[PDB]
């Protein structure tokens, strides 16, 4: 499903092609210059170049999809998908974090029979029984604000690992506010 | 059909043209060079010395009474006779009167003393003459009148005629005069003379005139000057327009004829054999149409060779095997010496010393511009030294 | 200065689109003769040999190609053809006696430029790849074979050209172009980025750079020290590294959009000349003395290259390669020049002392220019 787009300008046209290459999304920018006009066209081409932001876009897309499937009812992800492994892969691929995305992530760490018993009574602790051998991990989602975001907290026992994601097009103390109360809730409900 | 060696010519510079020229575009001047473009542009080429190098210079020249819509057809220039002094330029162009061409001829010559050679001053001193015919080629010739020499302009016309323009020392301007008075051999034409050559005889008072027309008719005339009579006259009829005719001595005189649909040829021993001894230059028609030609020593051997430039962008050079070499099997004749290629059709050439070293450069005007070609300095330097050391050794041996 | 008009050329057919870095010339079949390698976006790489108008042979990859190269990356002493696609693949081919690759491996994607050279000085060739987001990565081939990573550098300004240049003290150095007519030095420690600035109007001009320009005969692997930079607004600079600070040899300001930089020996005297080409086809050749030679190709240029090529009679000769928009590639293979400046004959004979002695014996004073002119005319055109 190849897609094309255009944008005309006094110096000429600028054409964009978006397509798929194996496991990759590919964007190509052409140019057609139909000296000062050429210099202006080059400057405009550079300006268009700096705003693809194809990296922050994928970051926000993935982080929004994870919060859209935190409920577990979204058809985006079907059965048999270990969300913990996918989250680990994503964190590994983007450890630095883009400077233009809207969403944020954070990870941390904080018996097995107790975990199974809690999973049996997950609705008592306002957790989720979602299961990925079908391993299950708890998760809690809530809307918050600060200066509007959706904060999701996913805990999987492996000693447990918890990921906090903050979901808000591309254009922290808000993250630290939820990070502070993340482990506090676990400590208070681990009784 | 195979070159007997490589070309000893290296290209020095190349000046680009906005628009093209024609076979009459190139002209002398001065060691300067004048090249005229069809759309009025006229350029002057020369070289400027700089301590230990030289730098080409290609400036533009502006001439007075040429309308911006005019189209230049032909150009020529010469120097005044030795008793006089000055440089004369002549340009024939065509105004576009609505839908009909209006031909015109302009003659530039500065009469103010001390400025007869200043090209810039000469550029605005022009006359203006109407034609009543479409001009073809402007050339000049030197004639003997009384005990003095004069130079006159010759112009071939759309009517099958040649018109002579001669200066009048009275009012200092050029006037048309009847042609039959001085050139009885240039009368009774029936086609448009594309090229005309007048070869004088040094030290005497005779000459050979040669001309070729569109129909292919070629006329040569051995003519006296004191009695103004035609000693002898020969003619022949080839096929296709005659793009060039030249008169030269192989060592006896001979004529080179360059047509367009046939190989170039040379008729040998005119004064003794007329037009029967015909030698054809081999393979000189496999490169489209021959547009220009030149006869000079491109070999530094003391004897002439023949250069042929084609529309197929080729620069063949032919050398004459003298019978003194004594190979009657492949008897005395012409064989291909070397051959060079270009990128655009070749239109004109000249053999003139531009750099100022005594070596002569070859200027080639093609469709895209002017190329200057020089002899390979390495070859030309190692060749001078051997001759000089031979000279000094011979002097020592013969002097003791 | 003087302009020239090269004539002899060969036209090759090529249907496809390509990046300005997907073309190279070198020996892929290991026969001491150069061949032409072009990588199309489609996923096919065409190799041209001799002067056929058709590709000598084609090798098909997967994905869209971004970089091509010929080199002894495997350190086996045999040259191989190595192609880097846009999505992070890495294909190898051996063509010394279609053409499926002999080795594949995934690497980081967004590749822009590529280089094969021994940078550290261990006698083994390393591979350097510069990416589209100011990230440079070094790799080495290790037999089990497989590429293994090395130090990785991060920069601010965009990366356009990689080079290896002999440093102040007999050691290779990795140099990268940085916008605004600047560059950076990467230290192969096994600050890691030493920026250098070279005046200047903008700070976003795309810059290109070439290094390791020869300076004599038989001193190719024996040294280096010169490098050159070109800016899109028409500025060329040739400068030498040395120890204290980089001495600038010369600078030239032209009015075209320079987008390529190569080196080529056209005069045949051992020294190499800087060759630059603009988008509209104007080409400049400058030696180490600011003597310029221009050459205009009346077309529009997609990609450019220069180097030794084997076109006729099985000989390697200097060649200029242009890619046109009319699905054609022009190879000019008669670009040799007898000299670079212009001199006539008198100044050339004046250098030699034999000519002075041999004329002093003749009793003619060589200071009378017309007399010597007459003598030379007599010697050249009337030798008897």
Swiss-Prot record, chain A:
Give the protein name, as stated in the record. Answer: KICSTOR complex protein SZT2
**What pathology is it implicated in?**
Developmental and epileptic encephalopathy 18: A severe autosomal recessive neurologic disorder characterized by lack of psychomotor development apparent from birth, dysmorphic facial features, early onset of refractory seizures, and thick corpus callosum and persistent cavum septum pellucidum on brain imaging.
Describe, as the record does, how this protein assembles with itself and its partners. Answer: Part of the KICSTOR complex composed of KPTN, ITFG2, KICS2 and SZT2. SZT2 probably serves as a link between the other three proteins in the KICSTOR complex and mediates the direct interaction with the GATOR1 complex.
Coiled-coil ranges from the UniProt annotation? none
How is expression of this protein distributed across tissues?
Answer: Expressed in the brain, predominantly in the parietal and frontal cortex, as well as in dorsal root ganglia. Expressed in peripheral white blood cells.
Tell me which domain of life the UniProt entry assigns to the organism this sequence originates from.
Eukaryota
Task: Give the location in the cell.
Answer: Lysosome membrane; Peroxisome
Gene name as annotated: SZT2
Q: What does this protein do?
A: As part of the KICSTOR complex functions in the amino acid-sensing branch of the TORC1 signaling pathway. Recruits, in an amino acid-independent manner, the GATOR1 complex to the lysosomal membranes and allows its interaction with GATOR2 and the RAG GTPases. Functions upstream of the RAG GTPases and is required to negatively regulate mTORC1 signaling in absence of amino acids. In absence of the KICSTOR complex mTORC1 is constitutively localized to the lysosome and activated. The KICSTOR complex is also probably involved in the regulation of mTORC1 by glucose.
Part of the intact protein present: 2979 to 3267 of 3432
From Swiss-Prot, chain B:
UniProt superkingdom: Eukaryota
Span of the signal peptide: none
Provide the protein's localization: Lysosome membrane; Cell projection, Lamellipodium; Cell projection, Stereocilium
Q: What does the entry list under GO cellular component?
A: glutamatergic synapse; KICSTOR complex; lamellipodium; lysosomal membrane; postsynaptic actin cytoskeleton; stereocilium
Q: Name one GO molecular function term.
A: actin filament binding
Q: Which UniProt keywords apply?
A: Acetylation, Actin-binding, Cell projection, Disease variant, Intellectual disability, Lysosome, Membrane
Q: Name one GO biological process term.
A: negative regulation of TORC1 signaling
- Keyword Membrane included in the entry's annotation: yes
Indicate yes or no for the key word Transport: no
Associated disorder is: Intellectual developmental disorder, autosomal recessive 41: A disorder characterized by significantly below average general intellectual functioning associated with impairments in adaptive behavior and manifested during the developmental period. MRT41 most consistent features are global developmental delay, macrocephaly with frontal bossing, high levels of anxiety, and some features suggestive of a pervasive developmental disorder. Less common features include fifth finger clinodactyly, recurrent pneumonia, and hepatosplenomegaly.
PANTHER family registered for this protein in UniProt: KICSTOR COMPLEX PROTEIN KAPTIN
Quaternary structure (record): Part of the KICSTOR complex composed of KPTN, ITFG2, KICS2 and SZT2. SZT2 probably serves as a link between the other three proteins in the KICSTOR complex and mediates the direct interaction with the GATOR1 complex. May associate with F-actin filaments.
Q: What is this protein called?
A: KICSTOR complex protein kaptin
Source organism of the structure: Homo sapiens
From Swiss-Prot, chain C:
From what superkingdom does this record's organism come? Answer: Eukaryota
Which SUPFAM superfamilies does the record associate with it? Integrin alpha N-terminal domain, WD40 repeat-like
GO BP terms in the entry: cellular response to amino acid starvation; cellular response to glucose starvation; germinal center B cell differentiation; negative regulation of TORC1 signaling; regulation of TOR signaling
Q: Where are the FG-GAP repeats?
A: 19-48, 110-139
Compartments, record wording: Lysosome membrane
Keywords of the record, alphabetical order, are:
Lysosome, Membrane, Phosphoprotein, Repeat
Q: Which InterPro entries match?
A: Integrin_alpha_N, KICSTOR_ITFG2, WD40_repeat_dom_sf
Instruction: List the GO cellular component terms.
Output: cytosol; Golgi apparatus; intracellular membrane-bounded organelle; KICSTOR complex; lysosomal membrane; nucleoplasm
Q: Which residues cross the membrane?
A: none
Principal subcellular localization:
membrane
Pfam families from the entry? Itfg2
Subunit composition and interactions: Part of the KICSTOR complex composed of KPTN, ITFG2, KICS2 and SZT2. SZT2 probably serves as a link between the other three proteins in the KICSTOR complex and may mediate the direct interaction with the GATOR complex via GATOR1. The KICSTOR complex interacts directly with the GATOR1 complex and most probably indirectly with the GATOR2 complex in an amino acid-independent manner.
- Function (record text): As part of the KICSTOR complex functions in the amino acid-sensing branch of the TORC1 signaling pathway. Recruits, in an amino acid-independent manner, the GATOR1 complex to the lysosomal membranes and allows its interaction with GATOR2 and the RAG GTPases. Functions upstream of the RAG GTPases and is required to negatively regulate mTORC1 signaling in absence of amino acids. In absence of the KICSTOR complex mTORC1 is constitutively localized to the lysosome and activated. The KICSTOR complex is also probably involved in the regulation of mTORC1 by glucose.
Name of the protein described by the UniProt record: KICSTOR complex protein ITFG2
